Amino acid sequence: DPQAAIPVIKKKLVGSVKALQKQYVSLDTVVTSEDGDANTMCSALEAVFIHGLHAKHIRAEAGGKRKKSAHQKPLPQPVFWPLLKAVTHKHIISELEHLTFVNTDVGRCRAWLRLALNDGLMECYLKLLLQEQARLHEYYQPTALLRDAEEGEFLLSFLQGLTSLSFELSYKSAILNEWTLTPLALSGLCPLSELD
């Protein structure tokens, strides 16, 4: 139960990257955010960071005066921005904090992830996050994917494979300011049931 989502996350991670490797076998071509498998990959990587967060890190709202008259789809809004800042160079933090259209901590987390993929740095960041275990304790319950020693070894090995692709994902879209369903369902925070 507290870890039921972990196999689901791992399958989507592996499956989406294998899909990307087979499609980008021209291999002189960049993966963009117009590619559905790249976005599925991003959703699975977001689910890694969402899984097992303490409830205090799940917001009812993302921020901004964005009208809630629509969005009759209310979704929880996980946020972990200071965890990411702790392992990031000030010049990346500064660029992320000054994005014209990204203006919520939700958006900054999701922008950070796509920027890290473009830079080829996801394994680098995870090694640091896994080295700063005390800070992880402040965001994650003991059953969380990121606090599971074995699954951490799986994830590092999976992330190493990402440098076989060249990413140019969009990390600056206003769309990043609020979550959608797929990362939340994959993480177990919302039911897989709700996907359709």
Added chain:
Amino acid sequence: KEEMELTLVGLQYSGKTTFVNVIASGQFSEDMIPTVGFNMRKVTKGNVTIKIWDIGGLPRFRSMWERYCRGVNAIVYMIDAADREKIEASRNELHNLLDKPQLQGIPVLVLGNKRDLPNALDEKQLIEKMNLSAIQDREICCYSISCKEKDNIDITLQWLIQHS
């Protein structure tokens, strides 16, 4: 800042002309003929007058879209939220449209119309299925609406008026 222009684009049958008629007159109608070329109406809302260019969405009119989007205050991209078969084409035409340099920076409001239909996709499902997060060069937003039963027409208008 009290006059503005919008262009409505998107695939045939998505509800663009219906949306214009509902904004201008409140008339919904179940029977419609596809728009040949373009349509236009001028509406006033408060102290804002809005000229709305309603372009045909059938394949042979889609080359018109880039031209009629040049210089406008905002672009409305209409989707039939209940027609999953058309999603691939609708997404392809959207990203193709927003690739054109002359349209750089123009705000875009994606509308998932026909929310009144059973198992219509909602705005968050459309955000994902349309790969909207690729669009990073402009203000961009996605609402679920229904021209038939008037859901979210209010805020749709309020969002567009913000760019007068």
